[PDB]
C-alpha cells in the first residue's frame, strides 16, 4: 500500500531547570526506527528498529551532528518565540515539528510535509506546493520572513522530493519483512450483561499492523455511529496494535447486531456477531 516517513521534533523549555530539552524520533509508517534525546547521559542517535542497525558509522554520526545542531537551534528559537508573544522568561513552552514524505502504492512522492507548532497550537506550515508558507498569526509571519530570506522552502522541497523519498525506499527494502508485511487483526465478540434487559457487545481487534483499522457496529445493517463506544487504537508493545468497539443492546436482540472489520491485512472485510 502507501508508505510514509516522518520525523517528530519536540523542544521544551524549563526555566530554572537547565537548558531546553530536544527530542527527535523517526518513523516509517507505524514503526519507530531512531531516537535522539539531548538529556541522555551521552546524547546520540540510537537505533529503535533492527533493520536500521546495518547503517554504517557515517550515518549515525551525520544524524547525531544534525540533532546536536538542532538542540542548539531550537533553544534559540524558543527564545525567539517567547519574544514574539511578549511572554515572560518564567514559563515553560514547547515547539514541535513534524516533517516527511508520503508515497503512493507505486512508490512515487504523493506529498511532502513540514509543519510546526507552538504550545500545541499550529504555528507555521509548508504548503503542499512545497514553495510557500502558511503562518498562523503575526508572530509566525516573522518566522516566515526569516525562512523566505534563507530560502528554506527551496531546501525543504529538495529534501522532500529527493533524499526523503530515497531513504524511505531504502528503509522499506531493508525492513521489507516487517514494514511491508500487514498483520491481520485477530477478531472476536464478547458479551457482558448490565441489567435484566440490556447487555454489552464488544468487538475486539488484536495483533494488527499497521494501526489503520475500521471497526463498526451495525443494527439491522444500519451503522450505529452515535451509539458505539470506540477506544483509541493502542500499541500492544510488540509492534502490533489493539482496538475495540462496543454497543449496548437489548437482551434477546443480539442477533440483530453485526461487527464489521476493515484492515489492510485482511483477505476480505470481516463480519462478526456474538457466538453464545
Amino acid at each position: 500500500g502507501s508508505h510514509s516517513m516522518r520525523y517528530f521534533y519536540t523542544a521544551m523549555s524549563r526555566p530554572g531547570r537547565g537548558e531546553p530539552r530536544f527530542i527527535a524520533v523517526g518513523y516509517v509508517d507505524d514503526t519507530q526506527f531512531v531516537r535522539f534525546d539531548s538529556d541522555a547521559a551521552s546524547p546520540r542517535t540510537e537505533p529503535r528498529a533492527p533493520w536500521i542497525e546495518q547503517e554504517g558509522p557515517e550515518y549515525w554520526d551525520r544524524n547525531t551532528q544534525i540533532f546536536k545542531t538542532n538542540t542548539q537551534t531550537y533553544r534559540e528559537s524558543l527564545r525567539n518565540l517567547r519574544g514574539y508573544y511578549n511572554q515572560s522568561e518564567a514559563g515553560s513552552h514547547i515547539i514541535q515539528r513534524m516533517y516527511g514524505c508520503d508515497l503512493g502504492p507505486d512508490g512515487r512522492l504523493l506529498r511532502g510535509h513540514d509543519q510546526s507548532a507552538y504550545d500545541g497550537k499550529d504555528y507555521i506550515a509548508l504548503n503542499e506546493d512545497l514553495s510557500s508558507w502558511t503562518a498562523a498569526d503575526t508572530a509566525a509571519q516573522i518566522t516566515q520572513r526569516k525562512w523566505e530570506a534563507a530560502r528554506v522552502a527551496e531546501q525543504r522541497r529538495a529534501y522532500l522530493e529527493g533524499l526523503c523519498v530515497e531513504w524511505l525506499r531504502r528503509y522499506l527494502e531493508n525492513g521489507k519483512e516487517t514494514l511491508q508485511r500487514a498483520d491481520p487483526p485477530k477478531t472476536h465478540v464478547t458479551h457482558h450483561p448490565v441489567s435484566d434487559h440490556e447487555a454489552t457487545l464488544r468487538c475486539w481487534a488484536l495483533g494488527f499492523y499497521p494501526a489503520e483499522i475500521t471497526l463498526t457496529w451495525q443494527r439491522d445493517g444500519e451503522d450505529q455511529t452515535q451509539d458505539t463506544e470506540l477506544v483509541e487504537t493502542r500499541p500492544a508493545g510488540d509492534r502490533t496494535f489493539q482496538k475495540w468497539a462496543a454497543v449496548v443492546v437489548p437482551s434477546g436482540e443480539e442477533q440483530r447486531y453485526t461487527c464489521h472489520v476493515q484492515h489492510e491485512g485482511l483477505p476480505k472485510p470481516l463480519t462478526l456477531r456474538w457466538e453464545p
Binding site: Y7, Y59, I66, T73, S77, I124
Partner: peptide, 11 residues
C-alpha cells in the same frame, strides 16, 4: 534520514 539545516537556522 533527517533533513540537514543550514548554519544558524532559527525560527
Amino acid at each position: 534520514h533527517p533533513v540537514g539545516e543550514a548554519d544558524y537556522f532559527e525560527y
